[PDB]
């Protein structure tokens, strides 16, 4: 049954997070094929009710599901209800483990090909309905699931551009926030549980820089507290590449970064819903990486944890500590990175 949770009640829950990334977001193999085609295009296994368990059995108690949408959407912006039944089935895979279980809109934003959400005037313009008509659709098909279940209006919108950090134009933090308007203003509509689920809205380019978050503007819930904000981080950029440790340096960045969104979000809670070791060429760690590397992304991890539970947020690993073949066992990727994120945490 339905017990409604405040957004920080419900980020204080979360604990250590994880990112079921490259899976219903992997896409670009076109339109009308098996479900079971895209959840595989990127390299991972079709998901399993064993990987849910798994990471409820070792230390972990939230998993975002990342999807991508626009290649399961006719030309009137249907979704196939094969695919919403998979994203569902995905969905009572984390319920029933025991978790808590984020979906969003994903790669339909950002850099790559066949985004359609853009910060930009004329684009938003122009997909307003179709992102609305959306979630609509996906607020009434997981409608029935509990406060464990939150949806996050867009991954990673960017301008025209695609540009990263910062939009080029102001213009771009209008269609920003509207777009997070028209998010809540969906999913409220379609009432039952989805009248004060909590929600979660993105920063532009889910980015933490000043003008970013002094332009971000939170949309108006006619309900209490079941709104949260999500940035990314693979901060310091590139560090996988440059350190040989996770130094003064790092350390003082991430403690920058906490800081000023701390300072930023007084009243709301906010998450870290993706980080990781991925760098320049989205070069990232795996278990063939030499022990200092897997060591320098063990610190990064260490300290993203501790730091994020000091300021009340919570945090979400970006794939690499349970990938590919590894999920299928199932068992860690990275049992060093998690043993670290687990000691940070308890
Ligand atoms: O960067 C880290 C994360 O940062 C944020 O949190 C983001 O929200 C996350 O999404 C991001 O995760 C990374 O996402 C990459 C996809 O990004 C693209 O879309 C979004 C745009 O903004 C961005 O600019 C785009 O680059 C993801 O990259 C994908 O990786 C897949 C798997 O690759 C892994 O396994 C195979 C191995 O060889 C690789 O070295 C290893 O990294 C790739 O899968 C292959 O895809 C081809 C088909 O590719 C075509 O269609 C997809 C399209 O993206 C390609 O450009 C196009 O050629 C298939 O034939 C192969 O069999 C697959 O292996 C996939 O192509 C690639 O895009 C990245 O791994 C993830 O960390």
């Given at each position: ?29 076109g ?10 295009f ?15 059995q070792?230390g972990?108690?939230?998993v ?45 934003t ?55 950090d ?12 509207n777009?997070?308007?028209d ?22 380019a ?6 970013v ?28 590449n ?18 000023a ?76 990175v ?6 940070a945490?308890?």
């Amino acid at each position: 049954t339905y017990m409604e949770e405040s957004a920080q009640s419900a980020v204080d829950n979360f604990g250590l997070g994880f990112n079921l990334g490259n899976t219903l977001d992997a896409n670009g193999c076109g339109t009308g094929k098996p479900v079971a085609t895209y959840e595989t295009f990127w390299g991972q296994p079709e998901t399993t009710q064993d990987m849910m368990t798994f990471l409820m059995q070792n230390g972990f108690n939230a998993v975002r599901i990342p999807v991508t949408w626009y290649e399961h959407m006719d030309a009137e912006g249907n979704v196939d209800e094969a695919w919403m039944m998979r994203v569902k089935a995905i969905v009572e895979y984390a319920m029933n483990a025991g978790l808590y279980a984020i979906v969003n809109v994903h790669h339909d934003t950002a850099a790559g090909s066949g985004a359609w959400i853009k910060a930009d005037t004329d684009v938003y313009a122009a997909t307003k309905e179709k992102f609305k008509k959306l979630w609509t659709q996906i607020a009434n098909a997981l409608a029935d699931y509990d406060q464990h279940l939150l949806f996050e209006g867009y991954n990673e919108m960017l301008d025209g551009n695609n540009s990263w950090d910062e939009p080029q134009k102001a213009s771009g933090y209008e269609a920003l926030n509207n777009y997070a308007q028209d998010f809540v203003d969906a999913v409220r509509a379609t009432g039952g549980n989805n009248a004060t689920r909590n929600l979660i809205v993105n920063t532009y380019a889910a980015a933490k820089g000043e003008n970013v978050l002094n332009n971000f503007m939170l949309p108006t819930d006619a309900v209490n507290n079941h709104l949260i904000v999500q940035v990314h981080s693979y901060d310091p950029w590139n560090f996988f590449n440059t350190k040989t440790t996770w130094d003064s340096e790092c350390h003082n960045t991430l403690t920058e970064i906490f800081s000023a969104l701390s300072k930023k979000f007084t009243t709301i809670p906010y998450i870290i819903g993706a980080y990781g070791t991925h760098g320049e060429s989205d070069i990232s760690v795996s278990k063939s990486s030499p022990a200092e590397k897997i060591k320098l992304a063990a610190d990064q991890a260490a300290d993203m944890v501790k730091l994020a539970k000091d300021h009340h947020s919570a945090t979400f690993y970006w794939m690499s500590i349970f990938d590919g073949s590894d999920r299928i066992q199932p068992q860690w990727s990275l049992p060093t990175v998690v043993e670290a994120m687990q000691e940070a945490y308890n």
